[PDB]
Design a binder for these strands. Structure first.
Ligand SMILES: [Zn+2]
Ligand SMILES: [Zn+2]
Lengths: 61, 149, 129, 143, 84, 36
RNA sequence: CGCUAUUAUUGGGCCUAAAGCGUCCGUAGCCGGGCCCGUAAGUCCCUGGCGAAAUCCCACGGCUCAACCGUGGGGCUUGCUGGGGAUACUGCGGGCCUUGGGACCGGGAGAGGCCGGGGGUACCCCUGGGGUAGGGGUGAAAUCCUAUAAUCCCAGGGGGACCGCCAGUGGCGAAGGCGCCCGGCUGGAACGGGUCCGACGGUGAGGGACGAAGGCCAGGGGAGCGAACCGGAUUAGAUACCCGGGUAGUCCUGGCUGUAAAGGAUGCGGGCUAGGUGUCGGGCGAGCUUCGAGCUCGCCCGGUGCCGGAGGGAAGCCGUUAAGCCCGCCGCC
RNA sequence: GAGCCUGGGCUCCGUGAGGGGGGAGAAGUCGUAACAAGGUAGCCGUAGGGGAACCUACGGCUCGAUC
């Protein structure tokens, strides 16, 4: 068949913070800065389009 | 197309046909509601609440997880705005423009923007009167609107 | 903007048939469109229409076989009595029994032949030949 | 663009549109406002009586060349003066001044003049209650 | 304001002509309104005499034009002397 | 004025702008003649 | 009356033949996305009371047949009204949805607009130094400037307008229109978005706002150009074309005028009917890299061009940026 | 409450010494504006001028030919 049902190109990620080893679910195309809930450090800087990841990706949901 | 500019842009969201929430969602409804209330108390709007839940907590389509919307969650408490948010954003834009134009009379290209903003406000007023979210005699007037913001 | 989706469905079918397509997609679905496709299939103008579920509305996938010359919606939806079908036949069709006039009644959507058997009238919506 | 209006509940505007754009036709305008009646010296009649004043001759239009004989006629209905053509060969000889004359239309596009002689609209039918055709053919004698 | 075309020149009726009445009305309508003070910044400046202007609130008293507190040459002199 | 764009063609005709200029002078004279 | 689809509901036209308001905002009106429940106003069926006769259609009968007259069956009277039944469509009332539309966040593009500050050459005049007889202009000449020292070169002072090449087949804007650099205030659009609202929409008579040049009013300024005008030439004549001068105006501040081949000579919204090759913006993915906000290739969205099959058209031509097939609204012939 | 007089309101026709442009008809006189790059490319808007077609200036369009 055809691609008539529009499906998203973005995905959710399970990343791990280097400092404290906390695992966290986050969005791939963010519009705000994403911070470690525990430490407070930034894991994903926002851009136009896809965001830059500053952590280790474990799973891509 | 755009109501004024008539340009056929398509830069929106592509949501999938979900009915049930996914399994990899950690939080539950009772936590999501508290998160909403807290982010509201810290002065955020509904759109930003949703954006933050999505980006930082991994909560897609709050309505899926909690069977109701954000404005419903906030009305169930004493936190919902008296004037809808679109109207207030537009009214703030209009107030700021009138301030600018009092100092810049002959700009003459932002007065048209002011006209367009007021047309949008009038459309929304006509809608909200019918739906009942405003009294049926509510009128926009910049004089009295200076105090709303 | 979008005012009438049945008209668009029928015009799309007409053009695709004119230029020789096998399948066609009708994006905003509706029960009127479903019933009209049912009547067309019963009378042998199409084959094997299916409904697909995207979270917005229904989509209709229709197969074509090479039997439609012209298909169109009737606007305005004129009311018609049981003793006045000949005028509209002569106005919309090319021969005394050639094609179908689709009528909405209080008993359902049907062809004018069945509606005449039952002895009732209704509203004209579509024609096919 | 599609032709408007076309909706089921839009008959008022249709009727107004047709009424408006019908005034651009000259037939309807003239018939309704009654202009021919206001500008006609025969006052809506197919014939009329008159009294002669002067014989004359009109030069034909190019590329033809000839002199058509005509006569100025004063009408008894209203006193207005018109010009009438005398058909036939020698017709102008069987007409003197102060003779009574019956006038008809000459026959032309839009109830007007004919080909070679523009400016004239009427022709003579009778002279002192006798047919000019009979006069010309010699089957009669005028009193 | 009962009049459509005439203003302060309605005082002397159909006399003296159109151009002259228009000019008088224009000048007087520009003059008699209130003006901004160069000291306090409020619209309270009126004329006292030919060339002498006074604010009512602060009491500022300055010299200026005959029918308006400023002149073009005055503006240009102010600018040029401020720069150089 | 309301202008017919056919008039601007030059075939059997004098130039439309000059014709318009000639028309605006005659109006001037006629109204003066009445004295209104 | 028809002919006449030259009044077009059926059933007409608006690039060039008559015809799209200069552009936009919006009032009435007309047209309005999908699902569920109810009502039964519109709508359909059945039955009661009315819509005089003559006139119209058919059959039979009487004057020889017929025209005519009589008997009976239908129709006409553009329809009104009393009840019963139905609920697909429209309307009315109440809930739900997110595709159309609006709001918000992010990183970027752009001569979009206003204000202030700083400059760049060139042109005109004035003051000094040098030099000496022509300069300017034309098809050819003359008026004109010049020994009170011109044209030309050098050093300085002042003034007014405009912003070259880069510059594009480019961009922003509703149109008109917008090009030196820096800073502040401000309008809109595209892209990306499991963000928010939940049909809030289209068009728009009447009304309103903006709107090249030119002209008018009031006040300032005025280098160059230049209607009017003054001269010199050409010419049979020259109220013109060419040459030398030159007022209003062209600039700024505040108003009026509301007009253009204000032209894509093509009104606006939505859906469908092969594509190819260029270029601007954003995004994704591959490769190179002097590691640069860098270069090449492909794909998605949006703008902006050139070709072209089917198709359309009187043709010229148009041809997914239709002048093709459908759903709407205004203006005009 | 007729009729008479009287003062006004509206509107169609009636008649008038004499002036202005318009249209046909003969084609008479002065020039040569337009069609070719028509011999100064043409046309729109505004303003000034001229025996006449027309000239000039600012802004615009190509329905403009050539290298
Ligand atoms: Zn951490
Ligand atoms: Zn003061």
């Amino acid at each position: 068949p055809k691609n008539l049902i529009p499906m998203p190109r973005s995905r959710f990620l399970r990343v791990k913070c280097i400092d404290c080893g906390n695992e966290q679910i986050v969005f791939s195309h963010p519009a705000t800065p994403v911070r470690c809930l525990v430490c407070g450090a930034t894991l994903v800087e926002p851009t136009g389009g896809k965001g830059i990841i500053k952590a280790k990706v474990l799973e891509v949901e | 197309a755009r109501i004024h500019a008539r340009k056929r842009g398509k830069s929106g969201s592509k949501r999938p046909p979900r009915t049930a929430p996914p399994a990899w969602v950690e939080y539950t409804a009772e936590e999501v509601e508290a998160l909403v209330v807290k982010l509201r108390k810290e002065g955020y709007s509904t759109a930003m609440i949703g954006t933050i839940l999505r980006d930082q907590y991994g909560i897609p389509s709050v309505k899926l997880i909690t069977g109701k919307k954000i404005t419903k969650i906030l009305e169930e408490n004493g936190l919902a705005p008296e004037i809808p948010e679109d109207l207030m954003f537009l009214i703030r834009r209009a107030v700021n423009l009138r301030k600018h134009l009092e100092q810049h009379p002959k700009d003459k290209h932002s007065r048209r923007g002011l006209q367009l903003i007021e047309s949008k406000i009038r459309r929304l007023v006509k809608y909200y009167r019918r739906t009942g979210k405003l009294p049926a005699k509510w009128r926009y007037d910049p004089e009295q609107a200076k105090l709303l913001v | 903007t979008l005012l009438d989706p049945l008209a668009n469905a029928l015009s799309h079918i007409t053009n695709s048939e004119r230029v020789g397509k096998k399948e066609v997609y009708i994006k905003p679905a509706s029960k009127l469109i479903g019933e009209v496709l049912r009547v067309m299939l019963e009378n042998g103008y199409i084959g094997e229409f299916e409904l697909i579920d995207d979270g917005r509305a229904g989509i209709y996938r229709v197969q074509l076989i090479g039997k439609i010359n012209k298909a169109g919606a009737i606007k305005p939806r004129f009311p018609v009595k049981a003793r006045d079908y000949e005028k509209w036949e002569k106005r919309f069709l090319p021969a005394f029994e050639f094609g179908i006039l689709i009528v909405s009644t209080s008993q359902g959507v049907m062809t004018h032949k069945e509606a005449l058997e039952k002895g009732i009238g209704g509203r004209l919506i579509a024609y096919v030949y | 663009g599609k032709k408007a209006p076309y909706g089921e509940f839009a008959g008022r505007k249709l009727k107004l549109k047709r009424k408006k754009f019908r005034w651009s036709d000259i037939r309807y305008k003239r018939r309704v406002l009654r202009l021919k009646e206001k500008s006609d010296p025969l006052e809506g009649a197919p014939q009329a009586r008159g009294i002669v004043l002067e014989k004359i001759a009109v030069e034909a239009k190019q590329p033809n060349s000839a002199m058509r004989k005509a006569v100025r006629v004063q009408l008894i209905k209203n006193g207005k003066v018109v010009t009438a053509f005398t058909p036939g060969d020698g017709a102008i000889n069987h007409i003197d001044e102060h003779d009574e004359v019956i006038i008809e239309g000459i026959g032309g596009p839009k109830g007007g003049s004919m080909g070679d002689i523009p400016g004239i609209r009427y022709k003579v039918v009778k002279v002192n209650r006798v047919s000019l055709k009979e006069l010309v053919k010699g089957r009669k004698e005028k009193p | 304001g009962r009049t459509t075309k005439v203003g302060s020149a309605g005082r002397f009726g159909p006399r003296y002509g159109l151009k002259i009445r228009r000019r008088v009305a224009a000048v007087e309508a520009r003059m008699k309104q209130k003006h901004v003070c160069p000291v306090c910044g409020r619209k309270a400046v009126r004329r006292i005499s030919t060339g002498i202007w006074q604010c009512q609130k602060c009491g500022a008293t300055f010299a200026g034009g005959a029918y308006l507190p400023t002149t073009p040459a005055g503006k240009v002199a102010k600018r040029v002397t401020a720069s150089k | 004025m309301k202008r017919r764009p056919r008039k601007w063609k030059k075939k059997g005709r004098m130039r439309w702008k000059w014709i318009k200029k000639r028309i605006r002078r005659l109006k001037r004279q006629r109204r003066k003649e009445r004295g209104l």
